[PDB]
Design a protein around this ligand. Sequence first.
Ligand SMILES: CC(C)(COP(=O)(O)OP(=O)(O)OC[C@H]1O[C@@H](n2cnc3c(N)ncnc32)[C@H](O)[C@@H]1OP(=O)(O)O)[C@@H](O)C(=O)NCCC(=O)NCCS
Ligand SMILES: CC(C)(COP(=O)(O)OP(=O)(O)OC[C@H]1O[C@@H](n2cnc3c(N)ncnc32)[C@H](O)[C@@H]1OP(=O)(O)O)[C@@H](O)C(=O)NCCC(=O)NCCS
Ligand SMILES: CC(=O)N[C@@H](CCC(N)=O)C(=O)O
Ligand SMILES: CC(=O)N[C@@H](CCC(N)=O)C(=O)O
Lengths: 166, 168
Amino acid sequence: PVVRRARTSDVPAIKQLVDTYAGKILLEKNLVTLYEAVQEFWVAEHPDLYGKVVGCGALHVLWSDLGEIRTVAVDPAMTGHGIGHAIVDRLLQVARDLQLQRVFVLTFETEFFARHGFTEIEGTPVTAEVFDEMCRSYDIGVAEFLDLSYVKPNILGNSRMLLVLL
Amino acid sequence: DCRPVVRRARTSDVPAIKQLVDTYAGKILLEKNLVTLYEAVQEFWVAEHPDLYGKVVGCGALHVLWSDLGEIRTVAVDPAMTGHGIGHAIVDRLLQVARDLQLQRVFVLTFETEFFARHGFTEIEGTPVTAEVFDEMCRSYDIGVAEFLDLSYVKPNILGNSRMLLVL
Ligand SMILES: CC(C)(COP(=O)(O)OP(=O)(O)OC[C@H]1O[C@@H](n2cnc3c(N)ncnc32)[C@H](O)[C@@H]1OP(=O)(O)O)[C@@H](O)C(=O)NCCC(=O)NCCS
Ligand SMILES: CC(C)(COP(=O)(O)OP(=O)(O)OC[C@H]1O[C@@H](n2cnc3c(N)ncnc32)[C@H](O)[C@@H]1OP(=O)(O)O)[C@@H](O)C(=O)NCCC(=O)NCCS
Ligand SMILES: CC(=O)N[C@@H](CCC(N)=O)C(=O)O
Ligand SMILES: CC(=O)N[C@@H](CCC(N)=O)C(=O)O
């Protein structure tokens, strides 16, 4: 499973992957937001059809020592082949290369992420001072990490998970 | 003066980037709070101080706007270190990021008309995207994007800036 940095030509395929699960499962992403985020997105290619994109994932930095895995989606016709886990592996190595100590994820796929050492947590693990700084973010994923009131209706039932990197 | 090293930002650079932005924030540079700078760290570049190891004397970002279009934004040099080639070295590296990303056009909104003319930027009027791309880009939460789109509610804050474009 080859995982590589996304290119702008991958964005339509990424968009189709997100829309497949957008709603309760994945937070929506419109096209412009995906172009804007292309330098943090990664894609998995089909093993035998060169250059076809069957999965995507992004690592989003939240603070100096904290990152989040987000927008991990695998083509439903290509699941169960190691693609999801390979994307998470590469995204975690990005977090390491960026010298992050902790990675967050908000998800229903509790056991999938438990394979990588993520454990369920309660609350929001940042100081009160960092919490107030992060509230000025415009990114809705950040508000979901912060558990802000106006996104509470959209995330009910998700598990909050954290991985401390070695 | 010799060409400085321009490298990808690390999270430990973000406070210094923040101070560079705050120096010019307002009429010149769009404001950037800490969380936004951390979130954008994977598109920021910094010029290393010529003599102070691990210190940065300038910063800049390449922001993707669409499949074939990018923007140079948040270029800032320590005012006590200007006029030594650091600004141009950052823009040089940002333009190579744009080509590696297969962008055909790079935008900048700026008062420094001549600084950017050295790289081939020319002044334009309006917003060079189709009506369909314009409508998609309007859904962005990024204020710089709204400035690129020339939306009404940001017109008072960008008066006097030149809109410039470089075709790669
Ligand atoms: C969750 C999701 C990303 C997993 O995608 P996937 O491609 O099926 O993931 P994998 O194939 O790597 O692993 C699934 C199973 O395939 C099998 N597997 C086969 N080959 C494997 C390999 N080389 N490595 C690991 N597992 C493999 C395993 O049995 C694995 O079971 P496990 O998770 O209990 O270990 C996918 O279902 C999805 O897109 N869901 C919606 C988006 C979402 O929920 N994202 C999480 C929030 S961001
Ligand atoms: C505009 C700005 C980025 C330029 O920074 P800078 O480091 O002074 O840029 P440079 O030193 O590379 O070039 C400026 C002049 O110094 C001259 N220069 C002097 N010594 C030099 C040297 N050893 N090597 C190279 N150039 C030198 C250059 O000739 C140049 O003149 P030119 O533009 O006519 O070619 C900086 O003043 C700034 O941060 N302004 C506020 C933020 C801003 O306006 N950003 C733009 C919008 S994002
Ligand atoms: C898209 C994505 O990354 N998943 C959401 C889950 C919450 C939601 N569906 O709105 C999240 O914060 O991770
Ligand atoms: C940070 C940044 O780069 N801001 C605007 C300048 C316009 C403004 N809002 O002052 C720009 O395109 O240069």
